[PDB]
Amino acid sequence: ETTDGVYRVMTRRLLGSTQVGVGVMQEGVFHTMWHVTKGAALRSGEGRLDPYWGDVKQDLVSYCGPWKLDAAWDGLSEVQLLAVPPGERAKNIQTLPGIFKTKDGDIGAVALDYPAGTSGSPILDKCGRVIGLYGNGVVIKNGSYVSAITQGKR
Amino acid sequence: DMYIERAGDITWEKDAEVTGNSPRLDVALDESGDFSLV
């Protein structure tokens, strides 16, 4: 199963399922954050998805092929988090990104704080292109989470 | 046992709610992929 879309990543323990994250299927490749799966194989129906590429520092992993998502934030426009919360239908949250300033350049960041099982949710530009994934970031104040817009390299 | 389940199209929504600040933060990224505030 490789139909394009956003997907929940679920885990079955000994008793009951839970959502551990989210991912993007595009061009036959499944994309998520490394810390969601830690590189483990995934089941998709009766088939198996094997990891293909991964990098802990970028916190990204791809299944069935190399990373395909290459769009980037234009640094000016609003974006949408396509959040897939556990137990709820997918929903779009529009926001203007802030910025992580690093010694190696700036990274867009969204100051949106959704439940943990939302990690891997895609961030979209106004043309619907995935410009990165949600869920690796920092906490600034008390509980105010800010996520990098994490994008790989195609 | 991890498995995936489709949850929607990848689409921009004209009726999305809008929210969130736009903070500018100095950060560092270490080899484990962890951001920290500078």
Swiss-Prot record, chain B:
Residues 1-38 are cytoplasmic. It is a multi-pass membrane protein. It comes from the Viruses. It is found in: Host endoplasmic reticulum membrane. Residues 4-38 are annotated as: Interacts with and activates NS3 protease. Residues 8-30 are annotated as: Disordered. Coiled coil: none annotated. Forms a heterodimer with serine protease NS3. May form homooligomers. Interacts with human SPCS1. Interacts with non-structural protein 2A. The central disordered region transitions to ordered by binding to NS3. Required cofactor for the serine protease function of NS3. This is Serine protease subunit NS2B. The chain holds residues 1418 to 1455 of 3419 of the full protein.
